[PDB]
Amino acid sequence: MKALILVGGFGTRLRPLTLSFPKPLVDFANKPMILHQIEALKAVGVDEVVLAINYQPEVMLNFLKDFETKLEIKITCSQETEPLGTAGPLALARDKLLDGSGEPFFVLNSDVISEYPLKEMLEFHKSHGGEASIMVTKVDEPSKYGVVVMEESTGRVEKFVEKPKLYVGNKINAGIYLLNPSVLDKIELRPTSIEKETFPKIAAAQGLYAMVLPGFWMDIGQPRDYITGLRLYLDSLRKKSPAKLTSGPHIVGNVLVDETATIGEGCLIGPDVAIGPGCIVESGVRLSRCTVMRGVRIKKHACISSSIIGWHSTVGQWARIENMTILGEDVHVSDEIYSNGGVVLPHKEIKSNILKPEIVM
Amino acid sequence: EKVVAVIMVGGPTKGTRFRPLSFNTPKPLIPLAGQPMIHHPISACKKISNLAQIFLIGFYEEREFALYVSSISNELKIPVRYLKEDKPHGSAGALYYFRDRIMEEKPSHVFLLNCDVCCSFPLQGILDAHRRYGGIGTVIKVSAEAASQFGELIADPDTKELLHYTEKPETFVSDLINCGVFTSDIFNAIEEVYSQIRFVRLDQDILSPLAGKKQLYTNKDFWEQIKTPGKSLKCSALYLSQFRETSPHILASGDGTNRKPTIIGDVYIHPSVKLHPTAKIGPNVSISANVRVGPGVRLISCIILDDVEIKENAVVINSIIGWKSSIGRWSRVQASGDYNDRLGITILGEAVTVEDEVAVIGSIVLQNKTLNVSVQDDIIL
């Protein structure tokens, strides 16, 4: 069985975290974002996975080469001269998706997280014998999205209604697909948007069906979404496997601690905090609603709330971090420094207070 | 006699202000008036006939400088060499490190100048003034109101000897300031503070103590400290003015339309550029190699790097366009020109694509960025 993952570009809207490592290599809740659905593709026994990137893969070849043996999965890249809309990258990778058996392959977006119930979707496919499958999630705001007007009896879609002034539905696409090999011929050589041109082509044929997502949905297109998207992930973890979240007298809520990370005494961590591996947490700290990446050491008596800590950084003693403060890789915050939303560039020594939201270079 | 020259370079922690440009090219190699920053000090070292080896020191990676140094010695025929101080000790400890390599040819006097300095460089005049003054080592008249930038410096104008020096605590000044040449005895003065007294700053424990002792001595042109990426324009005009006093034929002086655009003085045009006669290239503009200039475009008070694409009817005022950047048609990139304000000079990163009609007024754009909407008074990551 095959699979394809739409990455896109480098992650321009996720800087300064994507200034060095590309978009799919950012550690989200300890693990890089690409590993959250690659291991899910191993739950359905997928051997080969292709990435529809637009930049040069020369920078991430060492990372993808280390995941092929650990996860026992074939990982190959495809680079397009230009990203042809939404369905274009699929026309180029059709050669790596056809093994000859004519089995449906999965199409995933890198900007989406969910519970990924991929196993019970094949049975939802091998029951009625449909041709194409997408996943659908309910939203409170259907006007800001493209609404899918399906019937509440079987799951067939009919039309695409973007920005409905009146109520025609609340169900939108979730960015996860399930396509038979019989669809890779309906695309043209011209850049076509799968949401605007290709999907309506199969909806009018009534040869598709839809499934509802019984989980959380989040479109991560900005660095501030990492603290609230980590809530939806850790919440689902309290349901899926509650023993994967650390607990203790200094732990409150849902906290994901790594086996490599070390915590001092007299700290208070939570809720919704994720500490990467190789970190060094000193004593007297107070973490809340933040995420800590690899190798960064936070000194004693620091108070960090709802912020994002880069790789191999250093928070000085008695330093206060709050209000969506975004730090790059290797940023050294002096002691007694206050930051109120400072989006800082990597390789920077902070010796002054960012008392108000400010971009530091 | 024999003269050696040592230029300070600094590492990636000093060029942390030129960030949009520093990511592609370090601070010392950034083209000022068409040539890299350190390319003007090196050009002044050739006028000393008794000068030989040249030394560039700093904790940068030698891989970046090896390619550049190979091209300088092909022009002026001077032995330039880069040395990476593995243990950076600011300034004084920087040159005491590998003092053997510098004094390898027994030079009588050693030149020491900094990277971020924009003066006239009268190296042959100060060398002979030092030979007459003697002592170990050897200013510019500024207004007394301009004293927060430096501090206090006292020098008796009769012997031109430094009577007193405080780096930052001024406590009354004398209108004179440092600008950034010694004898061979300077290495012994560092041993008496590194070995005898025992991270050593040159202008704190070497310059200040040598006050009453008649060993430290003392422009008549221009000087501008350039640690700011915005200052890269105000100083660029002085170098162009220096290239407009001396040898102007190196400066573009079209002043017409015989397939040559309308050049409005103080313009350096590289021969590898592509131009259109309908463009007006105004004052204080330095164009680099392999750039495609569109028609009817206006270029004043700006510097353009290599591989830039300027489209139909573009306007560039008080700007610094990065490498491989693309300026769309009818798009405008302007700024106030205030060299004191952070956003007074709009700076564009490497391979930034300003789309058609998009306007950028006094803002800083990072490298590899696409702009479909106009921005104003912001810092775009």
Q: Is the peptide bond before A16 cis (omega within 30 degrees of 0)?
A: yes
The helix/strand/coil state of B47 is coil
- For residues B33 and B286, the answer to whether their CB atoms sit within 8 Å is yes
Q: Which residues of B333-370 are buried (b: 16+ CB within 10 A; e: fewer)?
A: bbbebebeeebbbbbbbbbbbbbeebbbbbbbbbbbbe
- Contacting residues of B for A359, CB less than 8 Å apart: 379, 381
Q: d(Cα B261, Cα B331) in Å, to the nearest integer?
A: 20
Contact B368 A10 (CB under 8 A): yes
CA A131 to chain centre: 27
Q: d(Cα A75, Cα A157) in Å, to the nearest integer?
A: 33
- For residues A117 and A215, the answer to whether their CB atoms sit within 8 Å is yes
Query: Left if phi > 0, otherwise alpha if psi is -120 to 50, otherwise beta: which for B134?
Result: left
**DSSP-assigned letters across all residues of A83-106:** --BTTHHHHHTTTTT--SS---EE
The helix/strand/coil state of B239 is helix
- For residues A131 and A182, the answer to whether their CB atoms sit within 8 Å is yes
Helix (H) or strand (E) holding A42: helix A35-43
Q: d(Cα A259, Cα A261) in Å, to the nearest integer?
A: 6
Contact B379 A359 (CB under 8 A): yes
Helix (H) or strand (E) holding A79: strand A74-79
- For residues A348 and A361, the answer to whether their CB atoms sit within 8 Å is yes
Torsion of CA A175, A178, A184, A190, to 10 degrees: -10
- Tokens representing B125 are 């005049």
Contact B16 A15 (CB under 8 A): no
- For residues A329 and A276, the answer to whether their CB atoms sit within 8 Å is no
Q: d(Cα A345, Cα A246) in Å, to the nearest integer?
A: 31
- Tokens representing A272 are 């919704």
The number of beta carbons lying within 10 Å of the beta carbon of residue B141 is 10
**Cα-only R_g, chain B:** 22
- Tokens representing A348 are 């920077």
Q: d(Cα B76, Cα B69) in Å, to the nearest integer?
A: 11
| Angle B102-B105-B106 from CA coordinates, rounded to 5° | 85
Residue spans of alpha helices (H) in B184-335: 186-194, 202-205, 231-245
The distance between the two most distant Cα atoms of chain A, rounded to a whole number of Å, is 65
State the count of interchain CB pairs (< 8 A) between A and B: 24
Q: Is A223 touching B (CB cutoff 8 A)?
A: no
CB neighbour class for A205 (10 Å; exposed up to 12, middle 13-18, buried from 19): exposed
- Tokens representing B273 are 């550029």
Q: d(Cα B31, Cα B37) in Å, to the nearest integer?
A: 6
Task: Select from B293, B331, B235, B246 the least CA-distant residue to B34.
Answer: B235
The number of beta carbons lying within 10 Å of the beta carbon of residue A232 is 17
Q: d(Cα A60, Cα A24) in Å, to the nearest integer?
A: 10
Closest Cα of chain A to B153: distance in Å?
Answer: 29
- For residues B348 and B368, the answer to whether their CB atoms sit within 8 Å is no
Cβ neighbours of residue A361 closer than 8 Å, sequence gap 6 or more:
A345, A348, B16, B17, B19, B20, B364, B379
> How far is the first Cα of chain A from the last one, in angstroms, to the nearest whole number?
46
- Contacting residues of A for B19, CB less than 8 Å apart: 345, 361
**Cα-only R_g, chain A:** 22
Q: Is A341 touching B (CB cutoff 8 A)?
A: no
- For residues A44 and A1, the answer to whether their CB atoms sit within 8 Å is yes
Q: Is B379 touching A (CB cutoff 8 A)?
A: yes
- For residues A132 and A202, the answer to whether their CB atoms sit within 8 Å is yes
Contact B379 A15 (CB under 8 A): no
Q: d(Cα B351, Cα A283) in Å, to the nearest integer?
A: 45
The resolution in Å comes to 3.5
Q: d(Cα B348, Cα B74) in Å, to the nearest integer?
A: 32
The helix/strand/coil state of A38 is helix
> How far is the first Cα of chain B from the last one, in angstroms, to the nearest whole number?
53
Helix (H) or strand (E) holding B21: helix B19-22
Q: d(Cα A19, Cα A295) in Å, to the nearest integer?
A: 18
Task: Select from A329, A351, A346, A222 the least CA-distant residue to B23.
Answer: A346
Q: d(Cα B329, Cα B226) in Å, to the nearest integer?
A: 32
CB neighbour class for B287 (10 Å; exposed up to 12, middle 13-18, buried from 19): buried
- Tokens representing A265 are 């005494």
Ranges of beta strands (E only) in B19-175 are 31-32, 35-36, 51-57, 80-83, 109-113, 152-156, 161-166
- For residues B115 and B39, the answer to whether their CB atoms sit within 8 Å is no
Q: d(Cα B155, Cα B217) in Å, to the nearest integer?
A: 8
Query: What are the angstrom distances between the C-alpha of B38 and each of A212, B50, B113?
Result: 64, 21, 10
Rounded to 5 degrees, what are φ and ψ at B327?
A: -105, 115
Peptide-bond breaks in chain B following residues (C–N over 2.5 A)? 138, 180, 198, 218
Binding residues of A for diphosphate: 9, 11-13, 23
Binding residues of A for GDP-alpha-D-mannose: 6-7, 85, 109, 111, 146, 173
Torsion of CA A51, A52, A54, A58, to 10 degrees: 20
Q: Is A139 touching B (CB cutoff 8 A)?
A: no
Smallest CA–CA distance from B14 into chain A, residue: A348
Smallest CA–CA distance from A343 into chain B, residue: B381
Method: X-ray
Q: How many residues does chain B have?
A: 381
- For residues A333 and A314, the answer to whether their CB atoms sit within 8 Å is yes
The number of beta carbons lying within 10 Å of the beta carbon of residue B214 is 14
The distance between the two most distant Cα atoms of chain B, rounded to a whole number of Å, is 69
Task: Select from B306, B149, B336 the least CA-distant residue to B227.
Answer: B149
Amino acid at A294: R
- Tokens representing A354 are 């960012």
- For residues A279 and A260, the answer to whether their CB atoms sit within 8 Å is yes
Q: How many residues does chain A have?
A: 361
Q: d(Cα A71, Cα B73) in Å, to the nearest integer?
A: 54
Amino acid at A70: K
Q: Is A359 touching B (CB cutoff 8 A)?
A: yes
- For residues A133 and A100, the answer to whether their CB atoms sit within 8 Å is no
Q: d(Cα A71, Cα B86) in Å, to the nearest integer?
A: 41
Helix (H) or strand (E) holding B8: strand B3-8
